[PDB]
Amino acid sequence: LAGNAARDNKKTRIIPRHLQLAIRNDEELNKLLGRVTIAQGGVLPNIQAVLLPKKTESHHKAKGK
Amino acid sequence: LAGNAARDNKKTRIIPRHLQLAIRNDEELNKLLGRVTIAQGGVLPNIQAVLLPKKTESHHKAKGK
Amino acid sequence: KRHRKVLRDNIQGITKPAIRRLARRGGVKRISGLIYEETRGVLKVFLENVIRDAVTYTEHAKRKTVTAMDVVYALKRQGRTLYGFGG
Amino acid sequence: KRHRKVLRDNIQGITKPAIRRLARRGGVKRISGLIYEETRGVLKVFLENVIRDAVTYTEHAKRKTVTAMDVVYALKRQGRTLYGFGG
DNA sequence: GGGTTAGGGTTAGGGTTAGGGTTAGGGTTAGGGTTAGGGTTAGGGTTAGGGTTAGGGTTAGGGTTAGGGTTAGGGTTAGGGTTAGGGTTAGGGTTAGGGTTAGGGTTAGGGTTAGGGTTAGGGTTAGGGTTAGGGTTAGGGTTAGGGTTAGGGTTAGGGTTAGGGTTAGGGTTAGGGTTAGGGTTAGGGTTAGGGTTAGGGTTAGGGTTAGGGTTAGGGTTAGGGTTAGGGTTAGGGTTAGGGTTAGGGTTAGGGTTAGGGTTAGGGTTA
DNA sequence: AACCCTAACCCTAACCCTAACCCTAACCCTAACCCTAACCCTAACCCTAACCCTAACCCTAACCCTAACCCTAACCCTAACCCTAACCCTAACCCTAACCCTAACCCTAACCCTAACCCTAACCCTAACCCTAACCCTAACCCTAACCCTAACCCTAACCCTAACCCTAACCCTAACCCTAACCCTAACCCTAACCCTAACCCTAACCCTAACCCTAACCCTAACCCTAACCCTAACCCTAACCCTAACCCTAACCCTAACCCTAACCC
What we know:
The structure is cut from a larger assembly and holds two copies of chain A and two copies of chain C.
Chain A: H1 2-9, H2 16-25, H3 27-32
Chain C: H1 16-26, H2 35-60, H3 68-78
Helix pairs in contact in C: 2-3
Chain C binds a DNA duplex through residues 1-2, 15-17, 29-33, 64-65.
């Protein structure tokens, strides 16, 4: 799984960022290591669909129409 | 579902492209209208993971060690 | 008396030699290991769909017995016209 | 010989007033109608997760009876230690 | 406002039920000597500690001014007061009996490492990739307004269809045959279930030369108005020839029933 | 490849007689077709601008070897799962019977809704700017990848404390034995809540000038860290003689179900 995440991120070695990518990608690994925090790594862009530019319509009208 | 796909594509009116987006996004709609082709619309970028640019220095050439 | 019912011992009902004989009758010489599980799953899904269609037809016909005519009608509605059994 | 109702309580017993009485224990005044099905679902999955561990614990000593000790052990392993009934 | 109907504190009467001894006993708590494991100091080499000197590099603070998403004052619309039988529905016993669960014994089943000699485990090394800086350019997202224009309101005249009376089969509910799916047992043998193993069968690097892939130039040929004139589409009276329906006669058609022509195995030489 | 028996379900009459195909009579509305000219169905010409059509240049891959290494391929002893009668039963199907609930056909007579028809808005396009991937010229720093060298875990000759099977009492959890009121369902019912239309307006939202602030280059120097011996303080494992702590069984005390009676909220003038 770490090699999978590594080729997904493309680097010469396995890094804790790739390890966190693989852990969050694998549902079984995420269920097993739930309370495990990997140092020297970021999170995954798993976001909802509300806080988006436009979408919610910042204008909605042109003052009159 | 068409409004969902429209706000996903952001346009002033519902277009056949948005209709095809909604049909392909909804699994029930895709199972119901399987042999239905929406004119004046494109497909969805649902692709695998092989045909990707990824030479990884290609190798095979001269010894770059 | 009969104090038992049916269990998990149903997906394994389609024995491995039976699936192998089916693959040989089709045109397969060598069958892999995980082929049997996938074949059993596909057969179970198809049987579930056909049995659901037959149950819907029987409930619409106000009956409690699945008949070969209803099975043939469901198979024709799915897209598989079967002859012989029925008419 | 066998019961004609083979439903075996398909997530039953959790009726509308029953949920309209457990939610009141916490302090819920207005209970929506779309909460009974979610409550039944979460209760079913919690009972399944507990019974899996209970069966895994009872199958270790080659025993075919589930006692309260294994139940409270599986509950303490999950993170909810109960006092009184176990001991 | 009203009298006001309503739950909410008292009071025996057993009925358990926590608890007040009572020896029983026997695990099980409770005591010496010892030695070899179990702690207890100080100094060297070295990771921290603060107090400035440049040397940039954003930067977040302050003013600001349209503007829109909220947050208010209503209008329709759903589920909690009720009540009540009655058909379930969920408690409590009685047997009982039977599988199970602890209770005791006996051989694999575990510690340990002498021990010395590996062999994997671990610092220390300089030579190829690295990994992302810059710098375009061409592709990809925002806004006024006008030229149609594709739709949002009118509207009045006919094709429905909702209003109402009257019959006829076509479904509705029992009431038994019955018969064809459920329910077992002997048994035996045949279909199913276990190892191997090695060798084909995949699976991954290493040339090269075909074969697609982008951009510059024309020279079209494919996108648009104007007719206009004939070749079909399309409703409207009117037959008469193609149909539909209530009555017999009746030839052709649908359940049983044998005895005879081939249809499957099994030892047959080839 | 025929036999060769072996022999069972297909095998030619044949025979009612049930019931649908039918053989004496009647009405009905709907297949062509002739006037009609409408507008979509008969071809003719211009143009010009995106558009195809046609060479040169080049770089990753399609495919054919190359070694190589791992998986489902076929007997073997089973022996468990599985055919083969042979009855033996107990529940939906299947026959109409007669009664109704449930359906036609028809005569209006008002409903109302899309052809037409204007009018208003809300976009298809331009025009600037503003973001926005993407791998080459450098070049360069530890953070990246390749070998030399050395030093305690990994380690197997006797041995020693418990899971391996096994009878065995007895007890506890379903069995289908058993009723019964107090909880599960149900239909009509109304009165608060849920959910949207407009309207301020105040919060907020994208900049532009400004006046410091905090890691680079490191700039020096100081407080206990741990690996050196070791050292007397400390803490179980064979003992043994008590000694502390549950078990079964009477025992008697306050919480337990029941009947009768007084404070205490919303009713709405």
